[PDB]
């Protein structure tokens, strides 16, 4: 292939019910999509970074400027183009993980779509639906909460992942064990919330029988945690620290993890993605697909990856209404907890402009 | 894809010079070959077993027998089949790793050739070319070995294996650096002839400088390479252990590998043989593609994946001629001790019918 | 003394009762028997593999081949054969464990005759009567499984192996447990059907007080095993995985397991069989005799090998009924939950011609 | 089988030179041996003690009371008698391995040749004929101790040992090595004379290509084994240590040993002696066969040991002559460097009575 240019648009799509994390309450996603334009024809990329920079050091304008000045040129100067050799081309550049994802997320939709072959197809999937859990925020209460998980768990999700901090820790938990029962797949996401001396808190969960607990520290303290799956019964789960496939085999081999979250855009591509998937199954740890609030078009990819046989636990593919009113694509609807994989070409998806462009904010086309 | 049915063939080719490693001799080739059927098109698979049960457990009458009986059966069933649904397909048949690539190499190169996709897209490759090596046999002469390994330089041949055995090991070696040099490319294969117990013989070999010993040790003896690999200089290369990727991974961990030779077949797969590349890769340690002395059907996609990030180092994929005097498809030649990557669907290659029934012995369809 | 041939013979023998692993389901069973011809006198060896390869990659077909093709001949054509001197002479032929140890039963059986030693004797026997357990397959209900094991334990066996799968683990465990006491030997083998991601589960059977849990994981997978074996309380005992002395070894410096189970077939004859009992004794691994529905032949050259000392735990060494209604040698009879170890030359016992040639299917003769 | 009784004899043979070790010297040979007897027919056994309790805490007089009161007896009491039930029962006793082995091995004798068995078929033979090393005692000059080896070397033996002692290392080593080239396979014995501390006085060997370095420290000191192995780069072997199968395994696991010496008595037996090669084969431990200075009777049981697969090392299984003139059997002769492996029952050798009774000191029987 030979790229024709980058179409770069910023999306604003206003969420159902603020969802507040460990780094700030959120009402409205502010996200980045890419249109590759080939010979052929044209690939999506979607950017997992935020407004500002509290997950990652990655933000919104930091990842415009990037593609647009660093990365997206690069590969125009390029004769060949591959996802594959995405990657090459951009390894001068240092770090930038979500933006040079979402771009290499274009790029092979293009290509799959061109041979016409399925996201899924391409990443190897086995099955053709995928189990759908969902990350619950922090409420400012405990029926609030109580109120909200026993909502989703009506509609069909099978896990539930409760948004932890210190203050919102074993409460809720103790409360929605309570009410729902034992039998229920709970886990918890701290975001970076604790520390190696809050072990003590965090040990506090071990009765309750959670299949996990996500980054309780920081992204870059693996042998903290390591230290502290010594500490507490709840399995380790890491999300922030996994930057790819590297450092998932490091973690893995320091004790310092047993189950991991793959963020496609965090480890820079459904590719390396795939990687760490099989890394990971290589050492038998256990994968799930995580969610970063996307449209239908990282939810198509995602969902695909998901599918890939080891991912053994429920992922935060949550449907499309759980955060978007109206999705830029034909939205994804649970049934039977399930969402199915999609079975046409590239992500088998794509937008709807009315509902596209009611949501765009800018524009910017990136050409030779 | 639907499955339709499947042709087994036996193919019969004579060695253009006499094969020998640690396990014998060998002056010819039976080859087993799989034609795919769809309802689309072809698909083309080359097993990696061989006559008797010597480099491993898989034979060709075995593999056979497995494959018509249970594994070409199992998947005809099967309302969908995909490349990679393959293995799940199988998996209630345990090992017949060999016998599961080839088939799985069919149905993959229909697959591809369907979608309009090479091996070597579908793999991930980033070059265009890879450089070869050559895998040098047992002489019985050392001024016989010298001539032929001067012969290969002269050809192009980027990197030198010779195959060691109890009683040609230093001295073979001995012999190439002083009379070639210390800035070839030099390493051995002992396809698992040596001990644990022979270790300080093995240690001789320290001085030479070579790139690697490919597995000294058993199949099975993991913690045992990784105790050589305490008792000896030259870095240590695993094959016939590394079935998976998660041998692979096992090995790493336990410091039994530094370096991994990918054969696709043995791993049961060129998606396998894949994963192996990725998690060795995630490891740090370096890969490079083995060979099975195969037709230019298994060599056009050892070539695609031979194309790797991570295939740092030359691998067993010589030139055609090396082995053959006439290939059943179009030959690999060596152009400045490189081959290149097949850019056709599929393969890249298809037998030239003309030849194939030349060396063709038997033909059963399954469907 | 010097091979003079091998007669190959194919035997199907029906089970009184359908036999259900993790694999498949069984309701005869297919063997292969061989009857090794020296000047000395013939011996009488047993094949393991069964139609298909499900257990392991070993089969019928394929043992029969191997041995036709490679293993018969290169023994025909030895100066001097010895039970011992099988293994070099076959060494050059990767794995075909099954069918070598067949093959080695065979010779070693003639030979033992010829010195009118029996197997016992030479194995190292110090026990004349063996502890005998049971193995109880998938059952289609609980209350189904509970009569079963109730049976059994009411015909005097000492133990009770329960096959498990997922879907079919802890309850039909409690169910047990729950119905016939604490106090009875129970364990039970999921024949490589789990995952290490599946420990949580497994890690549910640890307060029925299970003597052990036979091979979880697959066969290749030791380091998981290790893994795995540190996240339950039940202990890990592995089968697949032992493959060999060495393969015992490894596993247990890797801590990968705790009892083992031999199988003589499985590890290559019963001469690498007494070597693993060797092996596991020195690193104080407890060891118990494995059973793959064998006729009287195997199951007599079994009773001998767990005789030995290391055996302190109950075998897979049932009645001959337990798997057939007529034995095609004297059949094998429980005595105070025990059975008597053989005294003859050799196996101590043989086929009964008549009984014999009705299970035959085919038979063909290896000579020179 | 039910034992009748036993016959201990005192027994004493002169060697044709003196043997000096780290504990002593010996100029004569004061054996102990069993006739064991039952109602089909007899077998032997010999006892590898010595006069005192120099090279172990056991010695003759210490091993005929235990045997004599305890042992023996114990036998006796039991209806069934099969050499591998000697252990059980035999097992309330603490240690006194050397006389329970003695006992062992004549019951087995008199077992195995009633069903017309030899040693080599019961412990599993797959040699014919043996590797001979030779062991050198301490000289009283390097001129006197060249001269000896040279002897030796002459004679046909396949490797020297040297015993050492502080004192009495590196120049031997070194005397040796530079008349006698570097081609032989040389080995040294310290029979604990060394400790720790003396690692550096050690490490002063490590230029000289010994295959390995025995028994450096006290048998009680596997640690200080392991660590020692660490300081130097000569090969850790084990003797006095291995008094057992799962010492064996305690010693491998930590590393205090490279390659096994395996004595028989020292381990309570030929029977466990075999599981003691069985152990170390499933480690990658190399064994040989030690030696006792013994008559034929065992000389003829070590031969049959060494020709088990794992000993791949030449074992101190000597000829006859080295030690002695007259054998109280019919003599072992090298031949090719080696020893012919025992075809007969049992032993498959027996004591020419004359003889014996020219060199029996004592006699006793138990009933
Ligand atoms: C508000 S973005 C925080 C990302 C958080 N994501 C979710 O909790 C999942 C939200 C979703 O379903 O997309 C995580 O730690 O993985
Ligand atoms: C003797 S058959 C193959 C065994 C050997 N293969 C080669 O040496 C490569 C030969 C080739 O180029 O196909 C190996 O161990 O890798
Ligand atoms: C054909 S499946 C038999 C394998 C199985 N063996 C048994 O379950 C015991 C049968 C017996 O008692 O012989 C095991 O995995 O341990
Ligand atoms: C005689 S006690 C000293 C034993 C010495 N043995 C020999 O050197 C072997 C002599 C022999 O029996 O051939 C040793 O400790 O290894
Ligand atoms: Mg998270
Ligand atoms: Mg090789
Ligand atoms: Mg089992
Ligand atoms: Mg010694």
Chains 1, 3 share one sequence.
Not at 169 to 198: H, I, K, S
Not at 206 to 215: M, R, S, V, W, Y
Request: glycine letters at 10%; one cysteine or more; proline letters at 7%.
């Amino acid at each position: 292939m030979k790229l024709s240019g980058v179409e770069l648009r910023r999306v604003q799509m206003p969420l159902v019910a603020p969802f507040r994390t460990s780094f700030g309450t959120q009402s409205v996603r502010e996200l980045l999509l890419l249109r590759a334009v080939t010979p052929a024809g044209e690939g999506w990329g979607e950017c997992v970074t935020m407004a500002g920079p509290l997950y990652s050091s990655e933000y919104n304008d930091g990842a415009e400027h990037v593609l647009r000045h660093y990365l997206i040129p690069a590969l125009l100067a390029a004769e060949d183009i591959t996802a594959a050799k995405v990657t090459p081309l951009l390894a001068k550049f240092k770090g930038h993980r979500m933006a040079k994802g979402a771009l290499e997320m274009a790029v092979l939709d293009a290509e799959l779509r061109a041979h016409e072959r399925s996201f899924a197809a391409e990443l190897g999937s086995v099955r053709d639906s995928v189990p759908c859990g969902v990350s619950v925020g922090i409420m400012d209460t405990i029926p609030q909460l109580l109120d909200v998980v026993g909502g989703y768990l009506d509609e069909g999700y099978v896990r539930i992942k409760l948004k932890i901090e210190p203050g919102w820790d074993v409460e809720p938990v103790r409360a929605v064990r309570e009410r729902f029962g034992d039998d229920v797949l709970l886990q918890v996401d701290a975001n970076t919330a604790y520390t190696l001396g809050d072990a003590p808190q965090l040990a506090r969960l071990d009765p309750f029988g959670l299949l996990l607990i996500e980054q309780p520290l920081e992204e870059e303290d693996v042998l903290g945690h390591a230290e502290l799956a010594r500490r507490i019964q709840t399995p380790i789960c890491l999300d922030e620290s996994i930057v790819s496939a590297r450092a998932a085999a490091d973690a893995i081999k320091l004790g310092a993890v047993q189950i991991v979250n793959i963020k496609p855009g965090r480890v820079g591509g459904y590719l390396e993605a795939r990687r760490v998937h099989d890394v990971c199954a290589a050492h038998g740890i256990p994968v799930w697909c995580g969610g970063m609030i996307e449209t239908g078009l990282g939810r198509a990819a995602n969902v695909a990856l998901a599918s890939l046989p080891n991912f053994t636990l429920p992922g935060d593919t949550s449907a499309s209404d759980r955060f978007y009113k109206t999705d830029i694509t034909e939205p994804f609807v649970l049934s039977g907890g399930h969402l199915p994989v999609p079975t046409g070409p590239g992500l088998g998806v794509a937008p709807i402009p009315e509902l596209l462009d009611e949501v765009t904010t800018a524009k910017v086309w990136i050409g030779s």
